[PDB]
Amino acid sequence: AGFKPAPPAGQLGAVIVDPYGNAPLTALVDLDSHVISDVKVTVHGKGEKGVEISYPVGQESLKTYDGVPIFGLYQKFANKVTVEWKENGKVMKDDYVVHTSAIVNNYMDNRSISDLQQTKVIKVAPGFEDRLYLVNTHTFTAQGSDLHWHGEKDKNAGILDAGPATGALPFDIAPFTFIVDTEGEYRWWLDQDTFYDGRDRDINKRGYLMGIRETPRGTFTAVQGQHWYEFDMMGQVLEDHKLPRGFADATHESIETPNGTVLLRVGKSNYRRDDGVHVTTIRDHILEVDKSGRVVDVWDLTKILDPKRDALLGALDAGAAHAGQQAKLEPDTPFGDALGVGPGRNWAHVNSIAYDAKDDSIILSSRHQGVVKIGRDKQVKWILAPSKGWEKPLASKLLKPVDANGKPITCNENGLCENSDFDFTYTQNTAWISSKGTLTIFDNGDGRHLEQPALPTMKYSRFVEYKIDEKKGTVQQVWEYGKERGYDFYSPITSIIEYQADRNTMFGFGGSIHLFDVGQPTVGKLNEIDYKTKEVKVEIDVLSDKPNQTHYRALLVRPQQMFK
Amino acid sequence: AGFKPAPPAGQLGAVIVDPYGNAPLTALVDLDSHVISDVKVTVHGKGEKGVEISYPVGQESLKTYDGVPIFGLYQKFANKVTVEWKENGKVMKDDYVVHTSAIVNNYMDNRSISDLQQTKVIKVAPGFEDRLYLVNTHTFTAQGSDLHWHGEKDKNAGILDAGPATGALPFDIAPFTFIVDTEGEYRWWLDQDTFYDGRDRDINKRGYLMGIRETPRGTFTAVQGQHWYEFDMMGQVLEDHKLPRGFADATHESIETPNGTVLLRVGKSNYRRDDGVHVTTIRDHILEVDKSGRVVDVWDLTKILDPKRDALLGALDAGAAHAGQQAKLEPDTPFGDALGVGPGRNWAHVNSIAYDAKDDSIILSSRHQGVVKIGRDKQVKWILAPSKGWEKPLASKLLKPVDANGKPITCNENGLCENSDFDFTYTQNTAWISSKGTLTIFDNGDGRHLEQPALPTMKYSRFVEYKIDEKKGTVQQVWEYGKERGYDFYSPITSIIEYQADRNTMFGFGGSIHLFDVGQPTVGKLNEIDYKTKEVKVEIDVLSDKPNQTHYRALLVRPQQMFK
Ligand SMILES: Cc1cc(=O)oc2cc(OS(=O)(=O)O)ccc12
Numbered sequence A, B: 001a002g003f004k005p006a007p008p009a010g011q012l013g014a015v016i017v018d019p020y021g022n023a024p025l026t027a028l029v030d031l032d033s034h035v036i037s038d039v040k041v042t043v044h045g046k047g048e049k050g051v052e053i054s055y056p057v058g059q060e061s062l063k064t065y066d067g068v069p070i071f072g073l074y075q076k077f078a079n080k081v082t083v084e085w086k087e088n089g090k091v092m093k094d095d096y097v098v099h100t101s102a103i104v105n106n107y108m109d110n111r112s113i114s115d116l117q118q119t120k121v122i123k124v125a126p127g128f129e130d131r132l133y134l135v136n137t138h139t140f141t142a143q144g145s146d147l148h149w150h151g152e153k154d155k156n157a158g159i160l161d162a163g164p165a166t167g168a169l170p171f172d173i174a175p176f177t178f179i180v181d182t183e184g185e186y187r188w189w190l191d192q193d194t195f196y197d198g199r200d201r202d203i204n205k206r207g208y209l210m211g212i213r214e215t216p217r218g219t220f221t222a223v224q225g226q227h228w229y230e231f232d233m234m235g236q237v238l239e240d241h242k243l244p245r246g247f248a249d250a251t252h253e254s255i256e257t258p259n260g261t262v263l264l265r266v267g268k269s270n271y272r273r274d275d276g277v278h279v280t281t282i283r284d285h286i287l288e289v290d291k292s293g294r295v296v297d298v299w300d301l302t303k304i305l306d307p308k309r310d311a312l313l314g315a316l317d318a319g320a321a322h323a324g325q326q327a328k329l330e331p332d333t334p335f336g337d338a339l340g341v342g343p344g345r346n347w348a349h350v351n352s353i354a355y356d357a358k359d360d361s362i363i364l365s366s367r368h369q370g371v372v373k374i375g376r377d378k379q380v381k382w383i384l385a386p387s388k389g390w391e392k393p394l395a396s397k398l399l400k401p402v403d404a405n406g407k408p409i410t411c412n413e414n415g416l417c418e419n420s421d422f423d424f425t426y427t428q429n430t431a432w433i434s435s436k437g438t439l440t441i442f443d444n445g446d447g448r449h450l451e452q453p454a455l456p457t458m459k460y461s462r463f464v465e466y467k468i469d470e471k472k473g474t475v476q477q478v479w480e481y482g483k484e485r486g487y488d489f490y491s492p493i494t495s496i497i498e499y500q501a502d503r504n505t506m507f508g509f510g511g512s513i514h515l516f517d518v519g520q521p522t523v524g525k526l527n528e529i530d531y532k533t534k535e536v537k538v539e540i541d542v543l544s545d546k547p548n549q550t551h552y553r554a555l556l557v558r559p560q561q562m563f564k
């Protein structure tokens, strides 16, 4: 007799390209029963200025893969790779030439500019040549939203009518997942078929790939639709879980805790309203699940917050077609993925979670309400949002702005402060806990100060950081950036920042720059901003393969951790 | 329009039969947005002597299920069920008539006696009426073993010949998994199609469903073919993990540890022998994986033990056909699931794992070598086995028998002792650590004292318990049973015992009594022996649905623990 396997490439086994079949720019050196240790891989850069990628490989990984993991390959290229190890106390080395094949975009139509998304390197300081960024983005399907949850007909419903829709099953799009180096090169591709099939009508293979977050094992969590996953940089799918039967539409975030639980953002399916109508609620529930997929805890935001507060909601850009125009709420808006008040409408739009291990409490970003900390006791602990709209007892949880001296800062109910840089955040994203123990937010900025400005381009996003005295109920703004970069730095939606303590930078990714330039690719701008000087250390730009097709997130990933 | 969902049965949601589709004798009371605590359920007995099943339901479980788990229903019956909870400080109670459908055996041919396995209640002392036992048995497929792993041609192989076979892929049988009460009634069924498909050639759905072991959550882990799983009593598949690419043929055991990991018994695929032929090894590797499915550690027993020790290998029954006859080892036995020496043959047949938390070590049952403790450091710690055949440095590990006084006991190299009731174990099973801390074993008894006896019926199985002093290297046999019951209590293969501290019994199951009685159903014997008095508290017989078809194990399951 039959066909033999690949024969050994060097002093170990065969060198297999894309072993798990989901990551075509990876490869594996088969152990072939060799007992090695002290392993190190080096993928050599392409061209004169190509980037080298180098990393150690720990014993768990050798055992898991039964071989040496090769991450960092270029596509359709005779990659040169070097593996060093120790075998029998002798230092060993092999050099491999590893051909790869092509990256494929399986979702293309007449909107397609070309098959892959374009990179434009803009700025790369000295000492930042090694950086790698994983880009969480997507590409439109030819058919667009084609499926709906079926809901419950309301008493307002016509008699001959068919039942309605509910939840957000249309929140569904092809993934575009890759790592880019500082030369604008693809160094990693997650096969679109790994989790998604938009040609099939298998809802298990549908949704919006999101909330990709590293774990303590050097791996990543993710959510797509009605499932949550774990996977590594070799393209191995480590977990695949259906959501617990009460729940639906997991989007935006998934982060692992120190306790080995995972926090998910979902909705509640067949949620019984007070008027006795059932709906799939919209982005207003939080799950804590274990690695069995079981439900450790649940946070029902419809009973913690105020689903009737429309302070920010009514002040929104409809475009996020009818772009620019401020959002006019109506009382009879049908339930579903729509701007509105109450359960079964998009009242909350939680888009980010952070676990606070010090006090066993989650921190949350509600695009449409503000930022909050809720205890394990399901009690709100503090709020960070403009005073407008809130009633008690919530109103008393609002934080109070103060300066570096601790003296209060005077702002109105719309968030407009006086004689200060201090400002809140609006339609914000990733409200996380920096390594510093502070809170980093990406203040997208739509509906800032609870109004639309005289002109669409008058808008702007910030990186911004806050110091919060939970004891005193005060909040100090301690760092911002981007307020002065204009509409070319304004992302209305998605996006992220993250403090990088290793090089004292503030990482960021603006995911929808120029979303509203009808007919132009959308811009995903990768940034590392110097924390001390605000010097731009890295700037790189991703451009959508279709016009007006937003990006979601990016991560700063480190090979030294990818393979424990 | 459209079809409405089931309407509420009582004061909560609808009542769903077999919510997950894998456990037809279960139901779920949908929560319907009610917030309830203090939940307890009672499934009333059928007929006069019918056994009632009563249990608490924990929050996590209500949350996981979004409803109350109903377990313990009779097949095709109008089950009367009582659910009791608290809601708004007020006591609540509902009574439900839950109709159920039929249990199906999907694997029937002309060997079939009837479709389901028959039960015979023999003894049930008072105060033991409530017991439930999960029976882990199996039923022949029409085609039998139809698949093989492909191996590597050895140097003696004919030049024109096709490549050989390897590993143990033909270890393949449909499951028969049910819970039985002391009235002989089935009170739970795990749908055969849950893990197995024997008509389809998807090797992902093949194997031998075994090693069902409770977890710290009251769920169960289990292995079949090339995957390992976790499920619960509602039939929810909590985990489904492919084996790590290095390994194959998971059988016999899977046990979770206090550290979240899971121990598995596997073989090695593409194991490069010293002679450089690649084989899949047979039942001689131990994995420690985590719930991401990654290899945390591994024991290659072909380097830890003596794969050439044949003292027991040569003294075994061929029937385990050519039954009764003693096994005659040929050096040229083709690599595979065949009795013999070396990597690639069944030199070890490990069939139990115990984790010793006290020192981070594992205890293993090797059917063909004995019982050994290996350390985290991969060093053998002690061996419990007859002394014949062991070379240094292994022989110096053997435990030395002693009486109740610590006086040495005299045994010859074959395990046969003088003037004491102490005996060794032979082709044994489930060497686990009792709640007392002691070592319980199912001494199957084949090849006892390293020979076949004069007459075939001259065989017997023991329940047996040992106390070990590791510091001193001495083992004391401290409890036994089954020695007097003869060949009618003899199980040549499989089987299990576990000490039950709660009613001070020794639980036992004999999976293969009368296996060789040609034309006769094989007897699986559920036994509870009073520990102090050696009185039979429970004894129930399970008869195979085809002649000459072994059972594997049973578990004493507690509903009070099923839904935490
Ligand atoms: C895909 C998409 C289209 C759109 O027009 O509005 C969005 C708003 C979003 O908010 S966020 O989840 O807070 O980033 C996310 C994604 C979208």
Ligand SMILES: Cc1cc(=O)oc2cc(OS(=O)(=O)O)ccc12
Binding pocket: B319, B320, B349, B350, B351, B367, B428, B429, B492, B493, B494, B495, B550
């Ligand atoms: C099905 C079967 C037939 C047989 O004759 O030998 C076995 C040995 C087995 O391992 S053990 O449980 O450790 O004995 C398991 C199953 C079988």
